[PDB]
Design a protein around this ligand. Structure first.
Ligand SMILES: *[C@@H]1O[C@H](CO)[C@@H](O)[C@H](O)[C@H]1NC(C)=O
Ligand SMILES: *[C@@H]1O[C@H](CO)[C@@H](O)[C@H](O)[C@H]1NC(C)=O
Lengths: 49, 48
């Protein structure tokens, strides 16, 4: 906490709370595209996109 | 899709039991501003 706690909030560390699937152990998924909770090629950040 | 909704300080508690919970029906008319599921995966709601 001494060197990893920004006063305004350290958003550089991202913990994934919801995803399209569950990560395979020893598999580093760096998919930065939006996760889609429905079914469509989502372009903008909206509901289920 | 209730005609009238209760106030926040008087939130109404509905009991759901002895039936199959189909969340696709909810998704059919869901303009989900917030869809935050805690403790249960939203994609795993159809098999639990
Ligand atoms: C919501 O839709 C249901 C199913 O058609 C209907 O019975 C109900 O009256 C509707 N509620 C409204 C329009 O407030
Ligand atoms: C709303 O609240 C009233 C008063 O407690 C209750 O009789 C009624 O069943 C509630 N409706 C629903 C849909 O939960």
């Amino acid at each position: 906490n001494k060197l990893d706690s920004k006063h305004s909030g350290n958003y550089d560390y991202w913990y994934r709370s919801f995803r399209k699937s569950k990560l395979k152990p020893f598999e580093r998924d760096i998919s930065t595209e939006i996760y889609q909770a429905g079914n469509k090629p989502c372009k903008g950040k909206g509901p289920n996109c | 899709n209730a005609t009238r909704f209760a106030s926040v300080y008087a939130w109404n508690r509905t009991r759901i039991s002895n039936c199959v919970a189909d969340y696709s029906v909810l998704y059919n008319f869901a303009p989900f501003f917030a869809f935050k599921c805690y403790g249960v995966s939203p994609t795993k709601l159809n098999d639990l």
